[PDB]
Symmetry: C3
Subunit: 269 residues, 3 copies
Amino acid sequence: EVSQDLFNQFNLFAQYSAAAYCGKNNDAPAGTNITCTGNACPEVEKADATFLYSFEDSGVGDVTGFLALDNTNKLIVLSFRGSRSIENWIGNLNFDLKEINDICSGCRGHDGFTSSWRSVADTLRQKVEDAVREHPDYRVVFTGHSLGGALATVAGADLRGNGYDIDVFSYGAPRVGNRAFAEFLTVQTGGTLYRITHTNDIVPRLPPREFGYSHSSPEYWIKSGTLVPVTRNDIVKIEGIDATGGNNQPNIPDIPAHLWYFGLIGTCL
Amino acid sequence: EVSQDLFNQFNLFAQYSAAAYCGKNNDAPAGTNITCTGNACPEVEKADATFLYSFEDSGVGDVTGFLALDNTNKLIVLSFRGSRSIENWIGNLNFDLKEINDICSGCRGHDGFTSSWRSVADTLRQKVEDAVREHPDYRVVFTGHSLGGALATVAGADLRGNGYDIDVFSYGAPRVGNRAFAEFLTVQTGGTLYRITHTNDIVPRLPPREFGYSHSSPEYWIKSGTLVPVTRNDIVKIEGIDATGGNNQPNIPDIPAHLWYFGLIGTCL
Amino acid sequence: EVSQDLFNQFNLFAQYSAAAYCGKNNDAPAGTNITCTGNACPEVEKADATFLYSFEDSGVGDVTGFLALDNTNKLIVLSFRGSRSIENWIGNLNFDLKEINDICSGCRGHDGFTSSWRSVADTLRQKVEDAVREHPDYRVVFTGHSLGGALATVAGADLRGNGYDIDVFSYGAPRVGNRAFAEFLTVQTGGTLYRITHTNDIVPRLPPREFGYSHSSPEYWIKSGTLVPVTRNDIVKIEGIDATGGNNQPNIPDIPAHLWYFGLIGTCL
Ligand SMILES: *C(=O)CCC[C@H](CCC)[C@H](CCCCCCCCCCCCCC)CCCCCCCCCC(=O)OC[C@@H](O)COC(=O)CCCCCCCCCCCCCCCCC
Ligand SMILES: *[C@@H]1O[C@H](CO)[C@@H](O)[C@H](O)[C@H]1NC(C)=O
Ligand SMILES: *C(=O)CCCCCCC
Ligand SMILES: [Ca+2]
Ligand SMILES: [Ca+2]
Ligand SMILES: [Ca+2]
């Protein structure tokens, strides 16, 4: 169980993560309203939320998403799209571990994820920090589903510690680095990482432990089924690096479970 | 066992379905011959079959295929291509149920399939009915394999009842809606639906029953194996909504079976 | 165990295969240097290796790769890219067996691979034989990973016997034909075929035997795990048509093992 306040955040940013897949939200003019197709992001549409920066085909690995200004909830939301393109997928397969000592000592991260972030970090940092300067009373949030959740996590770890908190909400995100990194993400100050998972979704079980990957703690595990509405009693907090009994169980993994995080994520055209 | 006449129809429209995958058959001048590559549709090539309209990347979900004039068999054939593009696959993954009350009352259909048809319905109805006016003694037939069969099934349900019969021949189609839609598809007047499945092909088992999906009746089940020629003695008619004992059995599914419907389907470049 | 010399060749042409995946190595101007990204082909960069020809989107099935001139090792290298595009994957699925009487009587090959090679044979044969005319002292080597290895194998069979030897190095290649073709590939002279597999990689198990496919002999089997460096003691020569005990074992296959042949392969952007 989680509080209703946290459940409301979990649902809101699941819809910000879903909105990043909608192609129209990746090349939109600044200042226009954020909308989705179908009921993909009704809570985002209800808010007075507008584009600060909409980007696609960026850097290496086809980094795609948007930076949003939410005057209703008082948020500065950086939302990364997950995998869709072939280029996204080639980047996912660059799963060798690379050094990221600038982020934390002895830490290593997925080559693809960290190389994609590094290729856009200078542009996006500047835009985030411009928004923070103009709206110091707003909360900065990075979010994303799947690959996007991995990018949000890395970006968050990289930019924290510059005067403003950064909270990260990742949905169905893969492991992003080694144990050193997983511990850093568990204890890092200056913002909170909400790592959300759903039943037996396969993607948070990649890359496998055997390749040297670990998961930060805690884990928020959605136990309700696919196409089943989530209530705050269906979400269980699970503490411990590489903890089992949540998504990390030795059972059969599931693909449709990857697409149901409060609603459908990843399917907006 | 089926009659030799029906078998010949099953074999001919499997090749019309196969033809829809060939890229040259999605952007051809009107009036030119329909051909395939490497024996994909020899019966279509033998016939005096020419393009009335060829489309690609239409509507939402990358709707693709062609409308054919067959003077040998006196047919107006609408052939929908199945899954090939990323856009196709994203559409398939939009599997929550949406109201299609305008097609039949109480009915709910796959969100991707129905949205893809709605986004081309006015254009293709005009093309079909123009052809009907020009050749009012020809037989209208919608056909397709996999995603194409689902579009052909939804299109026929929508466009029947406007003065002409529409026969539908689907190959390896997934379930397209709830039980009400499955019953409607079983009983609708103004044309016949031939839903054809092969051994333990996985696609006609998707989306699973547990998401609220049902199959229309009857089912024509090909019992011969992959890469094995079909004879009329290898096809069995199975009646009953959500009948078991044909493709719908609780055994291990198979992916290559999906590509063998009288011949290789889905592979024409 | 293999000799250190043969190990060095296995390592070198795995890197030539890895290089074919980098996009900039498929439209490079003739005479420019062959380079990769992410340390994909260090040994190729060290060498004085330049492009003689660079191709992409060629023939049918999106044939892609390059022809290289290696003045350090005195090589003419034809390197085919493996599967990256949708068109590549569709060609893989064209798995019915087609007669290749122009190579050997009773032989049949994977329709897709043989069609793709046929569609570029005349052009590439001319490029290779131009290079042999200019550098008759050099050694002609065809190579490729996965689909690229299947193409290198078919090409070598077709072009051998015209006065210059052609050695073939394939990495994780699928089965390319029936047993007659597999026996021909085992006894053909005019060059040697080095068919290199890794642990329980799934691709060399495809298409399955039950569709009429067989493997040529011998097999060089890499026993060292994924992300583990390979030494000459980790490679086992395995003789015998459809020999078991190497990659052809009745155990669970693995997808990430397909990407680790001395290094990461198939992942260069
Ligand atoms: C996040 O990645 C966004 C994905 C959401 C999107 C958007 C919705 C449409 C997609 C589809 C995008 C288009 C995909 C194009 C290529 C995909 C090919 C395969 C896709 C699955 C088809 C069915 C086979 C939603 C579809 C994606 C579903 C699968 C996603 C995989 C994970 C994505 C990712 O981010 O990759 C993680 C990387 O770190 C890669 O990790 C690796 O090391 C490579 C692993 C490759 C697969 C390994 C196989 C799994 C191993 C376990 C085997 C199962 C057996 C278990 C039973 C044991 C018990 C006895
Ligand atoms: C390419 O390498 C060769 C030496 O092997 C030489 O022509 C030159 O140093 C390089 N050229 C470029 C453009 O890097
Ligand atoms: C041939 O189809 C093998 C595919 C190469 C894999 C590329 C990187 C995963
Ligand atoms: Ca709004
Ligand atoms: Ca003809
Ligand atoms: Ca060099």
